[PDB]
Design a protein around this ligand. Structure first.
Ligand SMILES: O=S(=O)(CCNCCCO)c1ccc(Nc2nc(OCC3CCCCC3)c3nc[nH]c3n2)cc1
Lengths: 299, 262
């Protein structure tokens, strides 16, 4: 069945299995192949695979990476995806000197918010947004990838897994150990990524849970009952937290314009209830002049 | 706030209404099965209830498992000695989809009381996956019930627990409940529960949401009312037992109304 695919190179390793750049010998299509060894004596097919395949077979959107086929040998399982040219992380490092043109940052954020609204509209939380998981092509698209950590949610939400989201991008409601979290966690991560696209360096590079909180608090101010009702009652909230004043938000990302600042401030709102949804953020004045140009660099 | 997903709840409902049709088992399947019966299915579902109770699994997992057993059996004939194996793979799969901490395969072999080997359970999992073609994100009675609960003013825990009780009982009996959709059973269960506890009715706000009225719910609502009244007598009893617990406000002890006054 893997009869028609010729391997080119190993791309990387995500949440589970290993990705390869391959091409169909018959159609010429370039694909990515996620390969999962199922030696069996483990615990059968892993829940990460069971989630990624059932969710991705439903999520059909130009800004969600496309699952093309599943090939299911007895002790080996292959997932065939559309292939993209690089990840956002590498692109940012490739733009080390020039920085990214504002129309490309703009476009990228718009597209990312579309893909995410679509996940949220289809009861799916991604739960691991970060530049490593966001893939770009030469034609100007950016797409959400690796739904290994994703899950299907109910309305309203139950308590789900706590060990969640890569740390630099983890929302404060998780860090404070709140029993319920929702779609706002994915927005926080896209908020951090927008900052990162402008500056080319992580907004909150923590080295532990507490250091992460403290880095967030020193930037947006330590939250109180006024800015976030019910903070002081959160399981991992400590009354001994240092109380930092909130920075003039223009200082957080200095090159960002007023409309940019406004958008970023609403993605980074402490209170998950008040934080802007993916749906609403699409209509923000920041995107009034939005186009979809091709990347300014060869990928 | 954001826990009830104000910006997406309508879209999500709309989406679920679409998938519950695509994910519907075929109603006439038991007639076409040579060796298993409605009663043999009852015994199995009742057992899975014990399993869920035994491993403290979510109720959502239970509903998901049964959807899988029902779809698999819509296109696969299975001998009576193997019906439990299908259910065990299904319950294993459901847990992998829905649970933060799912039981391990070794535990699933264990509650089948050494009827089947690990080898079998795993091979069966694989097979259920091929037949369902990995389509495990299925709408359930609870995904709907849970949104309906958002309409009571104010919220009543007796109502909530009773509605889930009645939904769960419907899982046991393929005749008749194999012909109603999750959303309609949820709606019947919600009304019946609400009326039993408060004397109130399926509210105008859910007519707006769902498009269902009492008139379109009546046929299901009439079957559900029967099941409720006959429950203490039903051969299968695990669900009654389960809902005596404080966890669910002991609702299975409540008295069903003698009439629905429809
Ligand atoms: O950026 S790359 O050139 C390789 C370098 N990446 C290492 C991290 C720092 O940049 C690159 C990576 C991936 C792809 N294309 C790609 N990648 C996937 O994912 C592999 C990736 C995702 C999660 C982390 C592990 C690697 C896909 N899944 C379906 N289609 C895909 N196309 C193209 C270039």
């Amino acid at each position: 069945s893997m009869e028609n695919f010729q391997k080119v190179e190993k791309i990387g390793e995500g949440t589970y299995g290993v990705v390869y750049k391959a091409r169909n010998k018959l159609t010429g299509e370039v694909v990515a192949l996620k390969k999962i060894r199922l030696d069996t004596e483990t615990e059968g097919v892993p829940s990460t695979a069971i989630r990624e395949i059932s969710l991705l077979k439903e999520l059909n959107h130009p800004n969600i990476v496309k699952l093309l086929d599943v090939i299911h040998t007895e002790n080996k399982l292959y997932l065939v995806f559309e292939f993209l040219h690089q990840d956002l992380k590498k692109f940012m490092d490739a733009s080390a000197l020039t920085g990214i043109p504002l129309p490309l940052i703009k476009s990228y954020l718009f597209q990312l918010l579309q893909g995410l609204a679509f996940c949220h509209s289809h009861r799916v939380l991604h739960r691991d947004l970060k530049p490593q998981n966001l893939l770009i092509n030469t034609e100007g698209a950016i797409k959400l990838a690796d739904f290994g950590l994703a899950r299907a949610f109910g309305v309203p939400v139950r308590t789900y897994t706590h060990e969640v989201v890569t740390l630099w991008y983890r929302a404060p409601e998780i860090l404070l150990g709140c029993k319920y979290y929702s779609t706002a966690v994915d927005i926080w991560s896209l908020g951090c990524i927008f900052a990162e696209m402008v500056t080319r360096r992580a907004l909150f590079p923590g080295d532990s849970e507490i250091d992460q909180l403290f880095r967030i608090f020193r930037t947006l101010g330590t939250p109180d009952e006024v800015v976030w009702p019910g903070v002081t009652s959160m399981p991992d909230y400590k009354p001994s937290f240092p109380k930092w004043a909130r920075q003039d938000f223009s200082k957080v990302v200095p090159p960002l314009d007023e409309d940019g600042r406004s958008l970023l401030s609403q993605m980074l709102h402490y209170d998950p209830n008040k934080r802007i949804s993916a749906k609403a953020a699409l209509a923000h004045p920041f995107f009034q002049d939005v186009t979809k140009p091709v990347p300014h660099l060869r990928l | 706030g954001v826990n009830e997903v104000p910006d997406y709840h309508e879209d999500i409902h709309t989406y679920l209404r679409e998938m519950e049709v695509k994910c519907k088992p075929k109603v006439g399947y038991m007639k076409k099965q040579p060796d298993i019966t409605n009663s043999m299915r009852a015994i199995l579902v009742d057992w899975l209830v014990e399993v869920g109770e035994e491993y403290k699994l979510q109720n959502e997992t239970l509903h998901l498992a049964v959807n899988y057993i029902d779809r698999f059996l819509s296109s696969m004939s299975v001998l009576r000695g193997k019906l439990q194996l299908v259910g065990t793979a299904a319950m294993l799969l459901a847990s992998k989809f829905e649970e933060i901490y799912p039981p391990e395969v070794a535990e699933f072999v264990y509650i089948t009381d050494d009827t089947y080997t690990k080898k079998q359970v795993l091979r069966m999992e694989h097979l259920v996956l091929k037949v369902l073609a990995f389509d495990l994100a299925a709408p359930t009675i609870n995904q709907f019930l849970t949104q309906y609960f958002l309409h009571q003013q104010p919220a009543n825990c007796k109502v909530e627990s009773l509605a889930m009780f009645l939904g769960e009982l419907s899982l046991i009996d393929a005749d008749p409940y194999l012909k109603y959709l999750p959303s309609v059973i949820a709606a019947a269960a919600f009304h019946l529960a609400l009326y039993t506890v408060t004397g109130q009715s399926w509210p105008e706000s859910l007519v707006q949401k769902t498009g269902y009225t009492l008139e379109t719910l009546k046929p299901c609502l009439l079957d559900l009312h029967q099941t409720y009244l006959r429950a203490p007598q039903h051969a299968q009893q695990s669900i009654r037992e389960k809902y005596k617990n404080s966890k669910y406000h002991g609702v299975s002890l409540l008295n069903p109304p003698e009439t629905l006054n429809l």
